[PDB]
Amino acid sequence: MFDPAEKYKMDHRRRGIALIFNHERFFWHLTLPERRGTCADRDNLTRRFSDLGFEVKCFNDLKAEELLLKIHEVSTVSHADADCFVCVFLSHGEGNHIYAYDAKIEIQTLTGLFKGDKCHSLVGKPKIFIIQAARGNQTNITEVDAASVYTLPAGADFLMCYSVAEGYYSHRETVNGSWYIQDLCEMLGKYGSSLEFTELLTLVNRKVSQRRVDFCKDPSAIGKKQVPCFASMLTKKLHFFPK
């Protein structure tokens, strides 16, 4: 019988794995600026997801090959005992690509590793990608980057979450971290274990979009609004109730 309020079964032994790929520096040949404040983001995300029951694993400044290797490895182990899978990318990006330390990687090749055919044990389970990546511009300072990464979906039961949409600007405080991640972690901390996750993501939309850009320490950044977005191909309601 069709249930209008059906929920993903979050009954399994483990919540699941949460991967964080953190990129603060890039090979000089790429000519990309450092991302000060990204370590605050990584730490913030680690605490939130960990409190949600996730097994969190972080990797700092991996080369492209090492990154592919690691995520392929994760995609080929069994997730039969897990509720879901989370993957977070903290870097710069361009169009369909995100930057590793030495080269860029296609987002689709990363998400494709978890598509039903390649990862049977995640079939029918939420696969959540959180992407903080924009165009690298070539005390607590706020750095403003233009949106650059296409806010695309990824397949059934995938949820793709983006820090910023085309036409808007991503912000990152060198001490406090990224606007998007801060607001995301805040909402996770307060409401993560009760609220339906796309409703929580909507709160993050509101929170970030309301951050005022009329008076900036840097007059260059005045009026450069930030609005996030998410592209959902989930098929059920997603909650992270305490296990």
Ligand X SMILES: O=c1[nH]c(N2CCCC2)cc2ccccc12
Interface with a copy of itself by CB under 8 A: which residues? Answer: 2, 4, 6, 150-156, 165-167, 190-191, 195-196, 198-203, 205-207, 209-210, 225, 227-237
Tokens at 159, concatenated: 């949820």
* Least distance in angstroms from the C-beta of 92 to a copy of itself: 20
Phi and psi at residue 203, in whole multiples of 5°?
A: -55, -40
Q: What residue is closest to ligand X based on CB?
A: 150
- Residues 37-76: x where in contact with ligand X by CB under 6 A, - otherwise, as a string: ----------------------------------------
CB atoms within 10 A of CB 142: 18
Exposed/middle/buried for residue 103 (C-beta within 10 Å: 0-12, 13-18, 19+)? middle
Which of 68, 152 has the CB closer to ligand X? 152
Cβ atoms 160, 153 nearer than 8 A: yes
Enumerate the β-bridge partners of residue 104: 99
Which of 31, 242 has the CB closer to a copy of itself? 242
Among 74, 123, 152, 229, which residue interacts with ligand X (rule: CB under 6 A)? 152
Tokens at 78, concatenated: 């069994």
Tokens at 67, concatenated: 């990154």
Residue bearing tokens 């990797």: 59
* Least distance in angstroms from the C-beta of 150 to ligand X: 4
Tell me, what amino acid is at 231? A
Residue bearing tokens 């607590």: 140
* Least distance in angstroms from the C-beta of 210 to ligand X: 25
Is residue 229 within the footprint of ligand X (CB under 6 A)?
Answer: no
The helix (run of H) or strand (run of E) holding residue 73 is: helix 64-76
- Residues 79-108: x where in contact with ligand X by CB under 6 A, - otherwise, as a string: -----------------x------------
* Least distance in angstroms from the C-beta of 174 to a copy of itself: 26
Contacting positions for ligand X (CB under 6 A): 96, 150, 152
